[PDB]
Amino acid sequence: QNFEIDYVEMYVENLEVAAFSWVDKYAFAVAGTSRSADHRSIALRQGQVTLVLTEPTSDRHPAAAYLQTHGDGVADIAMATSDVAAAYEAAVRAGAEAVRAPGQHSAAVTTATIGGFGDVVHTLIQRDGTSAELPPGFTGSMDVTNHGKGDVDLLGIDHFAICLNAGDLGPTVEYYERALGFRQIFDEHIVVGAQAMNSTVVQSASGAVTLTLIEPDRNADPGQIDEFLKDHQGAGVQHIAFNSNDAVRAVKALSERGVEFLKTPGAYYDLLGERITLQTHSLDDLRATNVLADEDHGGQLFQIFTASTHPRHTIFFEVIERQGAGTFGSSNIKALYEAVELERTG
Template identity: 30%
Template sequence: MAAPARSLCHIAFHVPAGQPLAQDLQRIFGFQPLAAREADGWRQLALRSGDAVFLVNEGGGRGEPLYGLDPRHAVPSATNLCFDVADVSAAARALASRGCSVPVAPVSVRDAQGTATYAVVSSPAGNLSLTLLERAGFRGPFLPGFGHVPSATGPGWVSHVDHLTLACTPGSSPTLMRWFHDCLGFRHLPLSPGEDPELGLEVEAGSGRGGLRLTALQTPPGSAVPTLLLAESLLGATDGQDQIEQFLAQHRGPGLQHVGLYTPNIMKATERVAVAGGQLLTPPSAYYLQPGKERQILAAGHEPSLLAQQGILLDGDKGKFLLQVFTKSLFAEDTFFLELIQRQGATGFGQGNIRALWQSVQEQAARGQEA
């Protein structure tokens, strides 16, 4: 592999001036300001909850934002994943030798807290760039060039990033999987027994609503990189654009569709998000009425009526369960969203929950079209 990723440092967003993403992350999701920088027409604010760090690049001035690339997106979006690597210069050379575009060659940034070296690589998921970062010995709160921002001391209700989901064009998952394997050290993670990595997991929504193909990737044990999910629409007739197709159309290509944020207490986290004004997706009404669903929820130690009230999905068996709740889009374009996830022993992604999420997004889109 060219540049094995050791950890996810941060996820970067590009938004226009005045877009309230940074405020929403604080007010609704409990993130706290970590560090800030203003230069060349850019306002960059890093926010943290546990080990999850988001970097909001606001504006769009001359040149590139520090530690990233200005992609000139058609819509506000999550545009960059920053990974820690052992040797940025060697990684950039290795990736370039494989034919990868390196629009920002290795550059070092120094301040009183130490030095960091980074390079930016174009990924095959068109709208998503990757920053490779080397910051051994840096002692500051975030990265060189950023100033500390005083914030509240209370911890947020998110502990780390659980997974990252890319919206991909139909048929592209095998190519993307090989790229992330060869370049960053990701490996196929089966979501079902005996799964063919070239085919992934097919989840049909039913009733002619289409569905999606999921391929999961993970880095070797010992790294701190979240699971990467490649999601593409299943070929077949649907009523209008599905959620993946809508993302591809609005973003004019593939990119980061949603981020799964791990919380140790999804009931409390969901309640806080709702009280703060966060908008959550409502699961299909039939979800909690499925045969065996009430028994499953009780076996996991939860009250069915409370989960239904908060829109929390639960899947799993044999003492291993997965709880998830999904927000509506963080942007007016109705594309990128967040997920809160809690695992009780489960390591995968429940097919029943995937199907329910798909139906929820499709029903939400249908209601928006009728309004």
């Protein structure tokens, strides 16, 4: 198959609170809805991000048990492919858990579902790639916009960061490589004080689905990833990164709409000009927005984390601008997790 993100589905306790949190704080548009005897859902749209929010209204629906375990979270990273039956057959033969066999399932395109990490799944969606399309079963239109968007301009999803139980990284990397044709593109041993993490990035052959997989290092003290695993009650999506053309301007625009970003101390910006010589922003700009700067063989990388507004403080989001950077960088990653540590330990 040749995987693109069709949509990301989150399971939610409260549809109207979640939908308008994305509309109001992040400038998503409402695109479509889907309802049955067991759920109500909305499809939200901005740039190339399609977010689906689903609230179960019956204990039949798998979200009821998910919400009881996790609170709100990502449940399905759905992938567009040209031949779903082929992609499924090959994935299952290579080891994928079969969750639902290819079929209509609603005048729908052909759809199937396989397992992913933890309890997150992947719906495979048949698309010929000629156009933006609503998730299957949804009525509405993809030609929608939020005219109150102002200066916020989220372009797409850059990657998903995922927390795994210790000892699960190596085998989850291998699963994505064998079942789905993903490749290992980056890896990083992360240290924050006396805690550490192991991480490996797998990415679909198309470039379009990236997962930054992280497990606790059992040789160091327990920290952030252990906390996530305990509070979430399992492996899961820790953050989603959204692309922008200009991270400084996105932080400003999102801040005004109510989004709180993590703080990075002035010491970091003092140390900076000796580490990297900036190419698209001023050191002043970065300092003011707590945006982090690093570099790849390919160019520069600007990233920032959002403070979690989840009741368990689990999932959070990231704004990322790539100026030729193709992967990630040690200094950004160390600083991102040090922002997290600062927020949570003080």
